[PDB]
Amino acid sequence: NFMLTQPHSVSESPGKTVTISCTRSSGSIASNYVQWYQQRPGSSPTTVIYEDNQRPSGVPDRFSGSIDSSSNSASLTISGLKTEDEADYYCQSYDSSNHVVFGGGTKLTVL
Amino acid sequence: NFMLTQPHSVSESPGKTVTISCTRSSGSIASNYVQWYQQRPGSSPTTVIYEDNQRPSGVPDRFSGSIDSSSNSASLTISGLKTEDEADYYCQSYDSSNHVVFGGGTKLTVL
Q1: What is the span of the domain harbouring residue B16?
Q2: Which Pfam family is one of this chain's hits (chains A, B) (predicted)?
Q3: Which residues in chain B have their CB less than 8 angstroms from residue A103's CB?
Q4: What CATH number does residue A64 fall under?
């Protein structure tokens, strides 16, 4: 089993690009699919990325997911930052028993 | 695919028992495992229940999960309510493609 650590908080200006990453302590980041959730206060977690890099329908292409197995991490990239992008972001994967593992979340502040 | 609806908000007195449920629109609630997350502000979602009714280690036995296929719903029960139980609660399951489905969340208020 393992854990996924992300920075608790990032901030960038509108129009800019920002990266948030998730490091896996254990085993390898590629062994299991990593998902990315956007969450606003009072709101449920929303899929921005599934299966490492897939954007569900309706999620802007400013959001991309990457896996770098050399650092054992997943990254969420937001290019062309909007103010509406300000929220919490959570990576999430699964362990060998299909138990869900969440990161700590990263508060994105838009300057 | 499907959705999971929960009440947005419940409130009960300390010492009391409270139930929060999750109804599946689609297919049957038993076809996929339902999980329950507790979440506090600024905090990541924490497993209180996995696999319908399993409590991970360290989660008090005041928390139980049930599946009632007759109403196509999962329920989270908290008996002996504490004030520390005040938080948001999310059910979560999977669709046929293993995509994650979250409920809307239920804010538990402890009176």
Answers
A1: 1-111
A2: V-set
A3: 44
A4: 2.60.40.10
